[model samples]
Target: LRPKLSEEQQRIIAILLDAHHKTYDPTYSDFCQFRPPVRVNDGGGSVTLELSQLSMLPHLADLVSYSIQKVIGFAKMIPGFRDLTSEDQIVLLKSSAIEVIMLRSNESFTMDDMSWTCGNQDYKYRVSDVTKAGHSLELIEPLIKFQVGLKKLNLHEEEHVLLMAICIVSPDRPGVQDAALIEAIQDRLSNTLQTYIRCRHPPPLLYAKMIQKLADLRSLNEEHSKQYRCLSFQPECSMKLTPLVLEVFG
Candidate 1:
């Protein structure tokens, strides 16, 4: 609502719009074009469990990496974000990468059963939940509880976009080259996010819960990443982790 915009504020405005469009454009195949999971039948089939895990997990990793890249691109498009040094951008993205993937993947999460839905199908094969995952559930169990909490809040699109932006703009992300500038930008972005949330519906309690949900999302990602790492570290398996993911997450 502040019309006489600073260059930074102007960038924030551009980001809000950019992020809004990016949010609904399908970050995951589950949200876009979901196919059946590579089924492994123990009926003495040729597709061995190891091979299934190998093929399936790598594909999963590819999807996760794709989603993170999409969000990172979204972050870079933020008005103030590109102004940050290249190193700063990489640090912010690497630090928050898991969080971005979690938020996008969990957008369609169900609170009741603590599962993911992909076109009328429930994929219960979390490396977090299944030993067969070979990559890494109890590991991911906390993530579902947190996702359930956020879903119950029933956040609108604007709030979701603001929340993701908030994740990217954090000053606490390590190796940032411009802490003070990002902190100031984060402050203004958050205040405007508050105003934006205030202008929407539902009780204040839901808003408060969503705020807490955002923080808990980071914690959930912390645990989730370890699971992903273990899953990625499958030396016994034959699948290849995508090169892009072979770094931070692998």
Candidate 2:
């Protein structure tokens, strides 16, 4: 049966929807730029920096810094999130921050050319653009594949935000102090997700694929952190990253 959301469940969704929009870039929330209509033409080619320019490092670093800030802000607003110990909160953010960012990247990721149009028309990023920063195709390959697979799922905003919330509330992250508390929170998020899916989507198995994306993010997070370490070794490159990024992913 397609049941209606309970009062509490509806409230949870409302809170998450509000928080998701509040923390994300206005472009994403207001214009839904993440899911643009099919482009009919190549038009003016996208601008790219020459490899010698090495300008992508600073821009990628800034993009990551912006995402980390939004992730932290959104995490704080999850219903039971602030109730956790500050240490736990930091642990969760540090661990899952990049994973959530990966998921959000799908919003801007254009499969046609395999690039991101972030915030505005002017700011587009291809994984190759970051290669100068010490990231090889080793990391970019799987990252792009994951983005493609996830974008195929074509999740609604409710599913997207709920999946992000579920990722953050995980109990198993290393150094998490309140396992039971976090698990309970994760349970609520997952239950809400299942209910939302049942009420709206026809394919019952879609939830499994969404949950699988979480596991995929874990592997991507590992490679991304490895690449970050590689980049941080370069003194000039390291300087581009913000303090928050260094502290969280450093």
Candidate 3:
């Protein structure tokens, strides 16, 4: 059965959804620019915003994607999702791409300070800002309908299990400034996990392993910060994987 949402939950969900509808300019010249490099040996190339920009900046896309996923996971614990044909499940995933885009966009790093150089030609470009300019409710409305239909099926127990699993397995990479939001999400996930454990329907051990992985990553980040005292820029004209730790999430 679909559990009734409290007023606070409803309000939060609305805020997150509305936030997702807003747009950030991905091509803004100041916030996102590209430039070419000078020497072939110099590390110069085409540059764009980092992928984790939205996560770091709490962009509308990030909020929407995260919110939609959480809500969908919670709904799945209801019978509505399962009662639908497998086709519908896949459909829902596909349909949620917009939300995903919104979320990812928010996390994308603004490439404002980038430059590219090729044969003495220097080019600079910025990420464009996104607004609610081209907002479409067609896809979103259908999904909402689908969710409502599923909820009427009263699949709460199973849906709850799925929600718990999602909570356990999903990566949690909140920005430093968004600690309160992160804590809220963590509290919800942790509570869900505990509930599952009490009911003997806990998520797989892999879920726990993922949590450990996050911890390990955090430790690695700290270690790297301690070891690296000074840094200098070197120009190279080759594909390289510079493993610099960032506060952004993939």
**How do the residues 1-250 of candidate 3 rate in per-residue lDDT, one tens digit apiece?**
3244545444433443343333322333322222211122112211222221211222323333444454454334422234444544444433333333322322232223322111122222111211121112333333333333333333233233333233322323321333344344545545444443445434324335434433433443333233222111212211111111111111
Poorest stretch of ten by lDDT in candidate 3:
237-246
Question: Could you give candidate 2's per-residue lDDT for residues 29-135 as a string of tens digits?
Answer: 34332222222222222322222234455656666777888899999989899989999999999999899989887888888888887655546677656564447
Model 3 per-residue lDDT at 217 = 34
The window of 10 residues in a row where model 2 has the poorest summed lDDT is 33-42
Candidate 1 lDDT: 0.63
TM-score of 1: 0.76
How much RMSD separates candidate 3 from the native structure? 18.0
Please identify which of the two predictions, 1 or 2, would achieve the higher TM-score against the true structure: 2
List per-prediction Cα lDDT, in the order shown. 0.63, 0.79, 0.31
By descending lDDT, how would the candidates be arranged? Answer: 2, 1, 3
Better of 2 and 3 by lDDT: 2
TM-score of each: 0.76, 0.86, 0.26
Preferred candidate (lDDT higher): 1 or 2: 2
Best by TM-score: 2
- lDDT (0-100) at residue 140 of candidate 2? 84
Ten contiguous residues minimizing lDDT sum, candidate 1: 127-136
